[PDB]
Design an enzyme around this catalytic site. Structure first.
Site, mmCIF file in Angstrom:
data_model
loop_
_atom_site.group_PDB
_atom_site.id
_atom_site.type_symbol
_atom_site.label_atom_id
_atom_site.label_comp_id
_atom_site.label_asym_id
_atom_site.label_seq_id
_atom_site.Cartn_x
_atom_site.Cartn_y
_atom_site.Cartn_z
ATOM 1 N N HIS A 134 44.959 12.190 -25.126
ATOM 2 C CA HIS A 134 45.326 13.605 -24.972
ATOM 3 C C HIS A 134 44.864 14.514 -26.106
ATOM 4 O O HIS A 134 45.095 15.723 -26.060
ATOM 5 C CB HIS A 134 46.847 13.766 -24.872
ATOM 6 C CG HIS A 134 47.468 13.038 -23.726
ATOM 7 N ND1 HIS A 134 47.774 13.654 -22.532
ATOM 8 C CD2 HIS A 134 47.865 11.750 -23.598
ATOM 9 C CE1 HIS A 134 48.322 12.773 -21.715
ATOM 10 N NE2 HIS A 134 48.389 11.611 -22.338
ATOM 11 N N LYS B 256 53.159 28.871 -25.954
ATOM 12 C CA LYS B 256 52.645 27.538 -26.265
ATOM 13 C C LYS B 256 53.080 27.263 -27.693
ATOM 14 O O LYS B 256 53.436 28.194 -28.416
ATOM 15 C CB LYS B 256 51.107 27.475 -26.158
ATOM 16 C CG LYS B 256 50.370 28.542 -26.978
ATOM 17 C CD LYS B 256 48.869 28.604 -26.699
ATOM 18 C CE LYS B 256 48.547 29.136 -25.304
ATOM 19 N NZ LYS B 256 48.004 28.057 -24.439
ATOM 20 N N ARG B 257 53.066 25.994 -28.096
ATOM 21 C CA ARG B 257 53.412 25.623 -29.468
ATOM 22 C C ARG B 257 52.536 26.366 -30.478
ATOM 23 O O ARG B 257 51.355 26.614 -30.219
ATOM 24 C CB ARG B 257 53.296 24.104 -29.657
ATOM 25 C CG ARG B 257 54.382 23.305 -28.930
ATOM 26 C CD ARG B 257 55.770 23.602 -29.498
ATOM 27 N NE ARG B 257 55.872 23.148 -30.883
ATOM 28 C CZ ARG B 257 56.377 21.976 -31.255
ATOM 29 N NH1 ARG B 257 56.853 21.129 -30.348
ATOM 30 N NH2 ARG B 257 56.410 21.654 -32.539
ATOM 31 N N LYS C 81 45.280 26.816 -31.557
ATOM 32 C CA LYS C 81 45.627 27.629 -30.382
ATOM 33 C C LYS C 81 45.441 29.126 -30.658
ATOM 34 O O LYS C 81 45.462 29.954 -29.741
ATOM 35 C CB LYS C 81 47.059 27.336 -29.939
ATOM 36 C CG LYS C 81 47.245 25.963 -29.296
ATOM 37 C CD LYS C 81 48.727 25.719 -28.991
ATOM 38 C CE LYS C 81 49.019 24.289 -28.545
ATOM 39 N NZ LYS C 81 48.561 24.017 -27.141
ATOM 40 N N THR D 41 47.973 23.001 -19.979
ATOM 41 C CA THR D 41 48.649 22.986 -18.680
ATOM 42 C C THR D 41 49.337 24.318 -18.430
ATOM 43 O O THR D 41 49.550 24.707 -17.279
ATOM 44 C CB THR D 41 49.685 21.855 -18.575
ATOM 45 O OG1 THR D 41 50.500 21.848 -19.752
ATOM 46 C CG2 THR D 41 48.991 20.503 -18.424
ATOM 47 N N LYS E 180 49.789 26.968 -15.021
ATOM 48 C CA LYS E 180 51.040 27.610 -14.605
ATOM 49 C C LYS E 180 50.835 29.111 -14.390
ATOM 50 O O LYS E 180 51.267 29.664 -13.376
ATOM 51 C CB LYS E 180 52.154 27.362 -15.635
ATOM 52 C CG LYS E 180 52.499 25.892 -15.869
ATOM 53 C CD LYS E 180 53.453 25.730 -17.050
ATOM 54 C CE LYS E 180 53.389 24.327 -17.638
ATOM 55 N NZ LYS E 180 54.223 24.255 -18.884
#
Ligand SMILES: OC[C@H]1O[C@@]2(CC(c3ccc4ccccc4c3)NO2)[C@H](O)[C@@H](O)[C@@H]1O
Ligand SMILES: OC[C@H]1O[C@@]2(CC(c3ccc4ccccc4c3)NO2)[C@H](O)[C@@H](O)[C@@H]1O
Lengths: 811, 811
Positions: free
Chosen positions: B353, B544-545, B550, B652, B656
């Protein structure tokens, strides 16, 4: 089995409903079907089915108290020795026969299912068990009563015997869950620790505290067939709501706060001044009193508080209730000191359970200052005002002031919690007549002279539900056959049985029931331990916590005496005996642990001597607990109650044996005195020093050597112990026991040896006459009525709490 | 409300039964009545009522697997990010409308009751949530599948924002109990730690171990309206069964073993080599594999093991399954090494992952030797034989041997767990096409060349139950109105919606549903936080984290750009935006914590500038979690998916947003690439460096100064940050952020700044045209079908596990 009428009716629709609900729970609650279902699954299915029957009554009872608004009784204890709940619930709800039939129709033996349940062993012995009997009686007498304590994750340790020694294992009683309790996380309350006091504008303020949450779990307490279901509320410690290493460790450190309710302190009659114990004591007190205050306010100004609230202190363990109540009333409710104190004393009452100085709670002031700074301040103020009263009453009596002070001087300054309790309570009681008298005579003589009206007696009792109907249905049945069922909640009716002392049928049936119980207990030992006992032997039983004062060692001396006498005269007939001793030793109590080893070591010799064979056997009953007491007591022929006169405050095991058809060998100690009074001394095997004789020995000095020098048979035994006769591979194993007996025996074992042995001879003599043994048994059973805890609680209610008990049925 | 047909039927008898059972649970289960009952009581009454409906199917499903004996799929994960269970259960059992009606008739709002439930937050983010979606899809596809993990007492921490900073609080999710789990203490298994290896007569023996018990808790996993209910089994750590200070401390020390399952490690994409984490990993592995072995033996010699067992490793976290299986097969089952290894590889498969080197697990050999001595021995033997194979395949290629070895040399010798996984698995997959390709191209190129057949892709997916039908019933309904309900478990049918790109009614309804969701989310923020947002603003969402890769910081730069442009030209119209950023930072991740503070600090300036007013608002969404994702995602207009190309393995959250009617601004990274492929790039706001461009920058060296020197608007922002414009009371507060951006930025924030800002302009341009915005939205929703986790799982089943999925209904 079902033939037993005291066990109720197996109504056709009731049996049908029970089977349906049993199956429903197996499916929806346990998520099992009959293919994979275990006896444990079946126990839980039955437990849930039975518990459902409490719900309506439980809700209705608590609503009833809200509507009727009676005075509420709060019984605060660090120990509730509840035992198992399944059978008790069925008995009290009249469901036993119905469930027996229902389970039978499903192809199950209900008695096998009952054995799956763990004891709720949240107590050490008599004190914890008294609390449990009291809860039962208070519900049966229709009192608006609430038991309050701690839900220990681990109760009294499970005792293993390995190599003849006690081993302790954690009592993980919640492993498979507790189907009887209802968690109430919504009613969680904050408890405060440490911090400091700010004295400011409004007054004193307790600040900078560390919080531990108290989560309540409520357990139903059914009265006997009166539709009353009261509540035992037990508090569980929970960590308060609000770097990687830092974060993770912070989460793990939540365990520290939660450790407060982790484990029961396993000491019987011994004060261990651990900070964790102090936290436990304050934990119960603070959370409980918050509940009390909330309920008081939600019922209709603190003038009426003692009219609506009674707080009963089970010994000094919850004594912090006194300064805590003062703290809440003064600091939070803003009452003046005098009014708050008036309220507090009228609210609180103190039951003293112990005589031994080392059992009294005396907390170092430094510990109290750190943990509970505001409480120490309050204690000091209580002390100042109380001693002012003493000074006014007894002007110039400076030593009395010193003796009565809540503050004990010395290298370590301490607070005497008993003194705090007497000062802050409107009633102080001992637990048997002899004990309550000695409180006024010596221990608290100064307090008695100041306030004689405070001092009372409340002789202990046991519930005849658990301790007769449950554990001995066969005896309960033969009694009900003659006198009906009213005696079950009116035990004084057992006196009617004196009319049957010459009744052939009743003599036959009493003896028959005892033999049935003995066969069943023998079957238990064979099944669970592969231990064989002689069914045609006298069952000689001493079961109770291992303590020097309880004198298991004296029993040991007698057992060895019997052995030595057999060896000296092998051809001489003796009444065959199975001598059974059981009880837990406190983990840190070296002598108690040595005593257990001595019992097993004696057994190792006696039980393997071919000259002795089945004429004498000595066995140590492993893991003595409430559930085991329910098995062995109904099987007992002889009840050993042999504490040094003046040391057993009451005893309750004594009462259980009397109710269950055993004859008693005992000293004039605790409630033994009243038991003998009720039955007639001619019906008891009373021996040994009276308190007066013990005191006379103390006056001149106890010299064990004198007895050793004058009693050849005793001399032989001591030499056997010293030389390694009972420990050939380790000859000096019992040197500490011998040294204590010879030079440092506080409990004068040697001084009662001769009278004990002679008294035991008379026991054997009577046992040789089955008819006359049984007739004396009838005389005991028939006069055990006083020792119902219903009688005890009715006295507490009328004489201390100011409430009238009632056997009235709820709709 | 009930008008929504996808929510099922409110059958008259069903509604009646539900009300009856609701009331029954309130009485018998909760021991409450309507007088004292709280909304929480009512939630639990509903939860128990709904749970009852799973029971029959749950028992029947598991019996079905016993009878049919299919190959069983074991999904091993350290994380299961399950969210709430009440609504999901109702949706999957077709009970939502019935319960809504039943609760309404009782005077209750079911949606208010649903909000009472805590998330099961037993994961960090995407990896844990993937596991949860996978469980849902496996049940829906009728696979005999078992989720296995740890029942953490505390899940991902609750995030509080205080003074603009993240604060962590314990996620006490079990406080009021979990009505969904079934404790199975009867199926408790021993897990071993430490000790040593004895090599003797039979072979190797692991002895002198410390035992920790693994108690399983089973949670039902309902498939979508197919009467399948699978099981998630989560293990809880329990201390093994077997002086006063000594005893008490010994009982308290039980906490140490029980700490293994206390708390989820809160790191997203970061390996922290803590011993406690290693214990957790072995804990799940050992207990799980015992279950697998037992079930295998109770189904009809280890030749057939891989025919009846699949073990899927969710990353390397349960990688110990490989040496553990070998250990059991060799040491306990006495198979020869070769056969055991054949079995192991055919049984195990590994999903990778993560791309970041610091996210890879590399355990020090010293730690493994101490904790798991036999496993280290087995790992070394695996390594020797594996490298022998490499040596045979690539003779003389010594560097390849070094690169491929399970053993990493250096100051601290370590085991590379990814290497162990590849060696011990028959399949290795990445989680999006770009990621799986790069695994074969660079990261595991040597392994790919050795065994190319091992390497696969399985592009991630999300369940359209939770992520459409539950969270966005309004959108689910307007879709079902056109194309029926089949799409709910056949998401590719959404392509039918392309026929409605010019349909006035559908354009109207898509826009109407979005506005309804935006109003509801605004109502949520107002109700729960008293935060007001502009309902007529573009909802610009990055949830998101918090991670440097990111690039929440890039979003920050754009937000400041918008602010500065408004201040430069106050009269110029701009599309009003509400920029929302949410996500948790790992407690030990300093930069992530600083980034949260920067977001709030930017808000502090922007949200209080009177020139700006409601034209631009920046808010930090507190405590981002699954339940919040279900609220904010359906309300989103713009989905921020702006990771540096090559850093987000899949994502992911992206999926969504696409399913829920948001348009995406994103880089060509992870599954973004395939999302754009499915929809057509013309329907995505794709910007910035491709992986090829990132690599070219790495080749010559990334110099942030160049961008600073060439972009005036960027220069302004950096100077604002440095000078204290966003922290006037602490001017140097953001120096670390500035320093990282200027000199140590691994993720090239500056390099994508210009393209990002320009791309955002095009976002605003399209939003000015509501019709065309909505038409592009339709083009997105209609092509989101590929990203159903049903598609993903069907691929795992057919391509790795060797089982055929089935939408067939059970009786
Ligand atoms: O009143 C109930 C019973 O109370 C005692 C006292 C007692 C006890 C138990 C735990 C203790 C813990 C700390 C200090 C003293 C304790 C006394 N256990 O049994 C008495 O020893 C016993 O005689 C009496 O019947
Ligand atoms: O496959 C599911 C998702 O997996 C990741 C990896 C990941 C993750 C979570 C916890 C971890 C703990 C330790 C080490 C690595 C970890 C990676 N979380 O999200 C990826 O970052 C994400 O892109 C992907 O969609």
């Amino acid at each position: 089995r079902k033939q037993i009428s005291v066990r109720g009716l197996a109504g056709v629709e009731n049996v049908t409903e029970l089977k349906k609900n049993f199956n429903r729970h197996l499916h929806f609650t346990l998520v099992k079907d009959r293919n994979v279902a275990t006896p444990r699954d079946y126990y839980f299915a039955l437990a849930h089915t039975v518990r459902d029957h409490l719900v309506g009554r439980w809700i209705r009872t608590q609503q009833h108290y809200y509507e009727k608004d009676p005075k509420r009784i709060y019984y605060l204890s660090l120990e509730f020795y509840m035992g198992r709940t399944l059978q008790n619930t069925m008995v009290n709800l009249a469901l036993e026969n119905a469930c027996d039939e229902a389970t039978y129709q499903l192809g199950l033996d209900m008695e096998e299912l009952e054995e799956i349940e763990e004891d709720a062993g949240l107590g050490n012995g008599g004190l914890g068990r008294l609390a449990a009997c009291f809860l039962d009686s208070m519900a049966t007498l229709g009192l608006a009563a609430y038991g309050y304590g701690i839900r220990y994750e681990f109760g009294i340790f499970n005792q293993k015997i390995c190599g003849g020694w006690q081993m302790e294992e954690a009592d993980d009683w919640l492993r498979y869950g507790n189907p009887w309790e209802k968690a109430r996380p919504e009613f969680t309350l904050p408890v405060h620790f440490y911090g400091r006091v700010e004295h400011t504008s409004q007054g004193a303020k307790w600040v900078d505290t560390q919080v531990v949450l108290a989560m309540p779990y409520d357990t139903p307490v059914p009265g006997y067939r009166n539709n009353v279901v009261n509540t035992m509320r037990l508090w569980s410690a929970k960590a308060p709501n609000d770097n990687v290493g830092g974060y993770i460790q912070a989460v793990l450190d939540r365990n520290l706060a939660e450790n407060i309710s982790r484990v029961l302190y396993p000491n019987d009659n011994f004060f261990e001044g651990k900070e964790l114990r102090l936290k436990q004591e304050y934990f119960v007190v603070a959370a409980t009193l918050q509940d009390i205050i909330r309920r008081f306010k939600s019922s209709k100004n603190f003038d009426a508080f003692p009219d609506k609230v009674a707080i009963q202190l089970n010994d000094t363990h919850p004594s912090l209730a006194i300064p805590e109540l003062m703290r809440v009333l003064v600091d939070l409710e803003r009452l003046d000191w005098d009014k708050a104190w008036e309220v507090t004393v009228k609210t609180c009452a103190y039951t003293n359970h112990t005589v031994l100085p080392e059992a009294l709670e005396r907390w170092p002031v430094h510990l109290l200052e750190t943990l509970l700074p505001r409480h120490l301040q309050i204690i000091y103020e209580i002390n100042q005002r109380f001693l002012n009263r003493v000074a006014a009453a007894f002007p110039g009596d400076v030593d009395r002031l010193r003796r009565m002070s809540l503050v004990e001087e010395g290298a370590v300054k301490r607070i005497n919690m008993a003194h705090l309790c007497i000062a802050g309570s409107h009633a102080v009681n001992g637990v048997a007549r002899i004990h309550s008298e000695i409180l006024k005579k010596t221990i608290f003589k100064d307090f008695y002279e100041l306030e004689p009206h405070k001092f009372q007696n409340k002789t202990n009792g046991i519930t005849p539900r658990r301790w007769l109907v449950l554990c001995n249905p066969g005896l309960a049945e033969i009694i009900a056959e003659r006198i009906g069922e009213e005696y079950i909640s009116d035990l004084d009716q057992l006196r009617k049985l004196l009319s049957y002392v010459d009744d052939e049928a009743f003599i036959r049936d009493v003896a028959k029931v005892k033999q049935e119980n003995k066969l069943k207990f023998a079957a238990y030992l064979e099944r669970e331990y592969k231990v064989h006992i002689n069914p045609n032997s006298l069952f000689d039983v001493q079961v109770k916590r291992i303590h020097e004062y309880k004198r298991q060692l004296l029993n040991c001396l007698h057992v060895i005496t019997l052995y030595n006498r057999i060896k000296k005269e092998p051809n001489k007939f003796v009444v065959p005996r199975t001598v059974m001793i059981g009880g837990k030793a406190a983990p840190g109590y070296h002598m108690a642990k040595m005593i257990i080893k001595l019992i097993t070591a004696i057994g190792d010799v006696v039980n393997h001597d071919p000259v002795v064979g089945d004429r004498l056997r000595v066995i140590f009953l492993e893991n003595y607990r409430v559930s085991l007491a329910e098995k062995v007591i109904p099987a007992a022929d002889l009840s050993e109650q042999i504490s040094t006169a003046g040391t057993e405050a009451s005893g309750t095991g004594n009462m259980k044996f009397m109710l269950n058809g055993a004859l008693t060998i005992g000293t004039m100690d605790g409630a033994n005195v009243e038991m003998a009074e009720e039955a007639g001394e001619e019906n008891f095997f009373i021996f040994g020093m009276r308190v007066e004789d013990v005191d006379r020995l103390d006056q001149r000095g106890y010299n064990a050597q004198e007895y050793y020098d004058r009693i050849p048979e005793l001399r032989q035994i001591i030499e056997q112990l010293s030389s390694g006769f009972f420990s050939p591979k380790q000859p000096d194993l019992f040197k500490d026991i011998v040294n204590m007996l010879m030079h440092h025996d506080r409990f004068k074992v040697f001084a009662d040896y001769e009278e004990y042995v002679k008294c035991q001879e008379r026991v054997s003599a009577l046992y040789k006459n089955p008819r006359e043994w049984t007739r004396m048994v009838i005389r005991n059973i028939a006069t055990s009525g006083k020792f119902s805890s219903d009688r005890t609680i009715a006295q507490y209610a009328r004489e201390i709490w100011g409430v009238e008990p009632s056997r009235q049925r709820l709709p």
